[PDB]
């Protein structure tokens, strides 16, 4: 009955913007993946270094559950080795990532009639993110030789841009909620296991 709190991540009422992606450390529990297998919502359920059918048989030192909202045609960027605005500037997985990426369409929750603009992504950055880096800076991006002095201008852009989630948009531009489960094996004793 000490079930890992998957419902708190997958079913949280609010999800974070991808540039400010949330992370929940998960330990000292039995993870019941049945709730994931028995879900009809998921459009993406892809695992790396682990098999989706074998999850209930494996034990891990720690689990991290990262969550955020992106648009649908960007879910393909949540995978090892990817490029693009999301993978490079917002949320980056390492080449040797061990875990699963789960995504489902959340148009009924995260769009609204005039458009929902509360979800944002980082559009400009001086360098690519490192794996699992979270950059929440709102500092003006200097695209040119001219310094910006904290002010937007000709070659000085605010680094974040809103998604406009219109309920009538096509699915490629609809909001998708994403959970990334990363499974870390250290030499320490294990704390998270499925029903063996």
């Amino acid at each position: 009955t000490n079930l890992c709190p998957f419902g708190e991540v997958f079913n949280a009422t609010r999800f974070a913007s991808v540039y400010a992606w949330n992370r929940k450390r998960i330990s000292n529990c039995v993870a019941d993946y049945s709730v994931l297998y028995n879900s009809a919502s998921f459009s993406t359920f892809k695992c790396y270094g682990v098999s989706p059918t074998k999850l209930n048989d494996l034990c891990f030192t720690n689990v991290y559950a990262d969550s955020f909202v992106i648009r649908g045609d960007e879910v393909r960027q949540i995978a090892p080795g990817q490029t693009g605005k999301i993978a490079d500037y917002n949320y980056k997985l390492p080449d040797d990532f061990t875990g699963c990426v789960i995504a489902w369409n959340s148009n009924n929750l995260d769009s609204k009639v005039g458009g929902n603009y509360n979800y944002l992504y980082r559009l400009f950055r001086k360098s690519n993110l490192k794996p699992f880096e979270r950059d929440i800076s709102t500092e003006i991006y200097q695209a040119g030789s001219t310094p910006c002095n904290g002010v937007e201008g000709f070659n000085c852009y605010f680094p974040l841009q809103s998604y406009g989630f219109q309920p009538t948009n096509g699915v490629g531009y609809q909001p998708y909620r994403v959970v990334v489960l990363s499974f870390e094996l250290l030499h320490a004793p294990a704390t998270v296991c499925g029903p063996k």
Partner: antibody, heavy 123, light 112 residues
Framework: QVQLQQPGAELVKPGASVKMSCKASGYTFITYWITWVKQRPGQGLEWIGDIYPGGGRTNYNEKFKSKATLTVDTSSSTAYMQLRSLTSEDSAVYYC????????????????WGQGTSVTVSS | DIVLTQSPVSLAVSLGQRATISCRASESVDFYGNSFIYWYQQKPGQAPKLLIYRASNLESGIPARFSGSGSRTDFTLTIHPVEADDVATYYCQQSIEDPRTFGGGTKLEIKR
């Protein structure tokens, strides 16, 4: 036009090595797994291993971890399998194919295939 | 290692008639309502072609003359009506556990 292209045939001396290519086109190479399968003349199919081209994670059949090494070159959208210390038992057709790995969709289904490289081990 | 056994090894069927090919798994391939069985068709000299995934789902572009059924250990590919260009060997594959394994194949011949 999704396409996987392999060289048709290779002749390689016993005890030597061979490296075979699988050139992908018509889709985003780094978002699909590439898998490799062995078919000995008149026999069924045998799974060799898989590689995810984004980052190059590999998974091997235990029977083939000493025989085969899978790599990719993402800049050329090409996957490679190297076979080491070849014997007559390695004479066969080797297929590359792709799968998307999505547990709620096609999963391990091989929807697109290369046409195979036929390897003859002879001196 | 799951062993898949296909019967019959060979099969002759007339045009318009029904061909049923069976695949038997040494262990259950059922996982939370899904049967992770795939069917492929291989004409001579060519790569296999995907027909069925998840034991009953038809790949797009494949005629509905092909159908997949079964559960747990026993699975079946059915071709009705059989046509002349169905001459091929048919293979089943499991992916519930690694290593993924294939059956030995069923060769289909047209009776004319």
């Amino acid at each position: 036009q999704v396409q996987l292209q392999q060289p048709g045939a290779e002749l390689v001396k016993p005890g030597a090595s061979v490296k075979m290519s699988c050139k992908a086109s018509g889709y985003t190479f780094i978002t699909y797994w590439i898998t490799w399968v062995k078919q000995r003349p008149g026999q069924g199919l045998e799974w060799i291993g898989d590689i995810y081209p984004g980052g190059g994670r590999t998974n091997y059949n235990e029977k083939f971890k000493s025989k085969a090494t899978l790599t990719v070159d993402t800049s050329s959208s090409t996957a490679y399998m190297q076979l080491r210390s070849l014997t007559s038992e390695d004479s066969a057709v080797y297929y590359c194919a792709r799968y998307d790995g999505n547990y709620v969709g096609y999963y391990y289904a091989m929807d697109y295939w290369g046409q195979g490289t036929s390897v003859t081990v002879s001196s | 290692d799951i062993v898949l056994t296909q019967s019959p090894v060979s099969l002759a069927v007339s045009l318009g008639q029904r061909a049923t090919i069976s695949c038997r798994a040494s262990e259950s391939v059922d996982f939370y309502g899904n049967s992770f069985i795939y069917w492929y068709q291989q004409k001579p000299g060519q790569a296999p072609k995907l027909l069925i995934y998840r034991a009953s789902n038809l790949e797009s572009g494949i005629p509905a003359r092909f159908s997949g059924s079964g559960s747990r250990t026993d699975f079946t590919l059915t071709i009705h009506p059989v046509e002349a260009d169905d001459v091929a060997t048919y293979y089943c594959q499991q992916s519930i556990e690694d290593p993924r394994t294939f059956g030995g194949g069923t060769k289909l011949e047209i009776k004319r």
